[PDB]
């Protein structure tokens, strides 16, 4: 009753990144930051520009 | 008291990798293996 992996706003491979990034711990934030950009006929019009 | 049997051969399964005799799996191999494990993981501080 709280959600599902297939209907949520965040999926498991999104956490597999944070759990095994093994980065400098100060770029992981800027990795997630991109990791939260939507993928839509509209969004790319913002990003690729 | 081990009795006086006639000598026979018997074998035991080396249970883990480490038991391999060292002049067949040399030191620096295991050390570089662990180093490959030691990538971006935790390392204690020199003072400790």
Q: Are B20 and B14 in contact (CB under 8 A)?
A: yes
How far does A32 lie from chain B, in Å, by closest CA?
Answer: 18
CA distance B47 to B42: 15
For tokens 């490959």, the residue is B36
- The resolution of the experimental structure, rounded to one decimal in Å, is 5.3
User: Dihedral of the CA atoms A33, A14, B36, B42 (nearest 10)?
Assistant: 70
Through-space distance between the first and last CA atoms of chain A, rounded to whole angstroms: 40
**In this complex, is the C-beta atom of B41 within 8 Å of any C-beta atom belonging to chain A?**
yes
How far does B41 lie from chain A, in Å, by closest CA?
Answer: 7
Q: Give the method used.
A: cryo-EM
CA distance A38 to A28: 18
Q: Residues for chain A: how many in total? A: 49
Residue A32, both tokens = 């997630």
Cα three-residue angle A4-A7-A13, rounded to 5 degrees? 75
**In this complex, is the C-beta atom of B42 within 8 Å of any C-beta atom belonging to chain A?**
no
DSSP B1-48: ---------------SGGGS-TTTS-HHHHHHHHHHH-SSS----S--
């Amino acid at each position: 009753f709280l959600g599902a992996n297939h209907h949520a706003t965040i999926r498991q491979p999104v956490a597999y990144h944070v759990t095994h990034s093994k980065s400098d711990f100060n770029t992981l934030t800027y990795s997630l930051l991109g990791g939260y950009f939507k993928f839509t006929p509209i969004s790319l019009t913002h990003q690729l520009r | 008291r081990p009795p006086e049997a006639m000598p026979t051969v018997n074998a035991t399964l080396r249970i883990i990798n480490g038991n391999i005799p060292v002049p067949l799996c040399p030191i620096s191999f295991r050390d570089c293996r662990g180093t490959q494990l030691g990538l971006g993981r935790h390392t204690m501080t020199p003072a400790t």
